[PDB]
């Protein structure tokens, strides 16, 4: 989730990580990961 908590009650608001380049004050999918 900052350390690990159980997956028995791991919910959406607790464990949801994401990946971004550097975000400013703002068939298969698109090929963006390298």
């Amino acid at each position: 989730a900052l350390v690990v908590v159980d997956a028995c009650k791991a919910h959406t608001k607790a464990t949801s990580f994401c990946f971004r380049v550097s975000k400013e004050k703002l068939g298969m999918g698109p090929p963006e990961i390298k």
């Binding site: 350390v3 997956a7 990961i33 390298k34």
Partner: protein, 207 residues
């Protein structure tokens, strides 16, 4: 859009509408039971236990000859040989039942042998909307039956919780391809990797 060989699929059925997928444990407890996926707002599911992939789609009984002896387009009517991503084993049925109810309800598992006696499961449509030789796709109606045994994968309505059986009970399935053949260096959903810059590790309750 359409199905071809070597797609990481997951078999869905729907029974509140309950979304159910068939899982696989591997390396012990060979008869494979299900896990729900309609309640994903309160549980993170496990999908590496149910990555299923087929690599051979021969004809109606094209191994008539081979029982005595790139990626192909499969149809309605053709046979399935299944493979897991965890166990790297083939999906079959064993003739000793665990129902103990004398209703001729056999249960399935995975077999280390590569003999195509009871590991081949041919495909049949549900309605007269599609016929023999039609175009397989995502979100269709599925009925799957074997060769040497020829019983249908259905859900348990007798006792306890719900689990998959092979008896005279036709339940509709969904194919659902998830991962296709993607290029190297390009990650898709469900591939292990590491986050080097240091390694993202756990110490020797070790949280």
């Amino acid at each position: 859009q359409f199905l071809r060989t070597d797609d990481e699929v997951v078999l869905q059925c729907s029974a509140e509408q309950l979304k159910l997928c068939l899982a696989a444990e591997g390396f012990g407890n060979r008869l494979c039971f299900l896990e729900p996926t309609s309640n994903a707002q309160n549980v993170p599911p496990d999908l590496a236990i149910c990555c299923f992939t087929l690599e051979q789609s021969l004809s109606v009984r094209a191994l008539q000859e081979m029982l005595a002896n790139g990626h192909r387009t499969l149809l309605y009517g053709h046979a399935i040989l299944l493979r897991h991503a965890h166990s790297r084993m083939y999906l079959s049925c064993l003739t000793t039942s665990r129902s103990m109810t004398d209703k001729l309800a056999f249960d399935v598992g995975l077999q280390e042998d590569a003999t195509g006696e009871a590991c081949w499961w041919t495909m049949h449509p549900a309605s007269k909307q599609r016929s023999e030789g039609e175009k397989v796709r995502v979100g269709d109606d599925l009925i799957l039956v074997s060769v040497s045994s020829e019983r249908y994968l259905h859900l348990s309505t007798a006792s306890g919780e719900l689990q998959v059986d092979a008896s005279f009970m036709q339940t509709l399935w969904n194919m659902n391809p998830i991962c296709s053949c993607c290029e190297e260096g390009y990650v898709t959903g469900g591939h292990v990797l590491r986050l080097f810059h240091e390694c993202l590790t756990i110490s020797a309750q070790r949280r």
